[PDB]
Amino acid sequence: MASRILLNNGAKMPILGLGTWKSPPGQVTEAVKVAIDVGYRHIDCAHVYQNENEVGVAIQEKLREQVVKREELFIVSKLWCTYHEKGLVKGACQKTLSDLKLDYLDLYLIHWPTGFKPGKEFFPLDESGNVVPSDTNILDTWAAMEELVDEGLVKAIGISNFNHLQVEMILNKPGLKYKPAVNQIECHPYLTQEKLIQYCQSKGIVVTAYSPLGSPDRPWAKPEDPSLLEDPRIKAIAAKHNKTTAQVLIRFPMQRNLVVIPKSVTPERIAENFKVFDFELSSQDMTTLLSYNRNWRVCALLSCTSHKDYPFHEEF
Ligand SMILES: NC(=O)c1ccc[n+]([C@@H]2O[C@H](COP(=O)([O-])OP(=O)(O)OC[C@H]3O[C@@H](n4cnc5c(N)ncnc54)[C@H](OP(=O)(O)O)[C@@H]3O)[C@@H](O)[C@H]2O)c1
Ligand SMILES: Cc1cccc(Nc2cc(Cl)nc(SCC(=O)O)n2)c1C
């Protein structure tokens, strides 16, 4: 198991990163500091997570402490849906760089393929509870992302929550300057993403698996929902390998040549989640975990099911 994966831009992306969605501002600074101390070299961030300033504080402390150099870190952020308009992309990227206190990002992603009306609200809703779209399309937003690479503000650009047709739209864009390096998608034993992973890997696009533990802190969770961390079948695989259920869940995507970004703000769990390079799931273990697929999404963006670019009507 190599600890990094080569991207189509020539850079090496660490296969394990720390997620930061739902990491409250007063906890995330310590979380990122613990993560860097433990050995994480990749942090997944987003403007919409509303904590980039605090992530910035942590990165800067560790750089000043000389625990790491900037070139050893791989920092990802994401363009939020209200900034798809071509003329807003650069400003959004610059606000993120300013919050993170960085001169460049390693990877900047279009967070979702759906553009939302610009303004103060992250999720601008109509009276029916559906998001108000922006008059934007994916290809113009991609061209604005490419300008960030030309200016040196970001080393690589990519996408998140794009279906294969939407990726194909970018790959076939007239005058394409840069291919996406990464597609960041939800992926875990209940949503195994076989077809989309096959597709992406066949195009040289690295896949990053989000919500690998099933996002037990997601705010919309319901008691009837499935729970990976409580699944007795996965606990039995963990018990066999003298590991925790979370560690099994993190190792799983690693053996599929995916990047994985488990989130925690608990120092003991940050450390636990990093101890996944000292064991191997068997061929049978992988086949078994893949069989748990149930097409179940944490993140189904249900307020956008009428949006022209909603990604999840397509099979993959
Ligand atoms: N591109 C996108 O649209 C998108 C969407 C979703 C997620 N993401 C990214 O992917 C990351 C991970 O996904 P996620 O945040 O949804 O969920 P996750 O990483 O699947 O689960 C995080 C939850 O699991 C808990 N946890 C972590 N390690 C654990 C352990 N070893 N034992 C027991 N519980 C543990 C965390 O608790 P504590 O924090 O309290 O320890 C938190 O409640 C996000 O933070 C974000 O960076 C991206
Ligand atoms: C309180 C509130 C109001 C409106 C919408 C949402 N849904 C969110 C919020 C955030 Cl920060 N992230 C997601 S999905 C995670 C992602 O897109 O990375 N969904 C939430 C959590």
Numbering used by the authors: 0 to 315
Paper text:
AR catalyzed reduction of glucose to sorbitol is the first step of the polyol pathway through which less than 3% of the glucose flow in healthy human cells. However, under hyperglycemic or pre-diabetes conditions AR is overexpressed and the activity of this enzyme is implicated in the pathogenesis of most of the diabetic complications. Only more recently, in 2006, this same inhibitor was also discovered to target Aldose reductase (hAR)1415 and AKR1B10, the Aldo-keto reductase protein family members. We have determined the crystal structures of WY 14,643 and the hAR•NADP+•WY 14,643 ternary complex.
The ternary complex structure, hAR•NADP+•WY 14,643, contains two protein molecules in the asymmetric unit (molA and molB). The ternary complex structure was refined to 1.65 Å resolution with the final R factor of 16.8%, and Rfree of 19.5%. WY 14,643 binds hAR at the C-terminal opening of the α/β barrel, near the cofactor binding site. The carboxylate moiety of WY 14,643 anchors the inhibitor to hAR through three hydrogen bonds with Tyr48(OH), His110(NE2) and Trp111(NE1). Proximal to the carboxylate, the pyrimidine moiety of the inhibitor makes vdW contacts with the aromatic rings of Trp20, Trp219, and Phe122. Furthest from the carboxylate, the 2,3-xylidino moiety makes limited vdW contact with only one residue, Phe122. Notably, in the ternary hAR complex, the loop from residue 114 to 137 shifts closer to the 2,3-xylidino moiety of the inhibitor in both molA and molB compared to the binary complex crystallized in the same space group. The WY 14,643 inhibitor itself undergoes striking conformational changes upon binding to hAR. However, in the WY 14,643 ternary complex a distinct cluster of water molecules, W352, W392, W484, and W528 are situated around the polar atoms of the inhibitor of molA to form bridging interactions with hAR atoms. Besides results from current binding and structure determination demonstrate that only one molecule of WY 14,643 binds to hAR and its carboxylate moiety occupies in the anion binding pocket under experimental conditions explored.
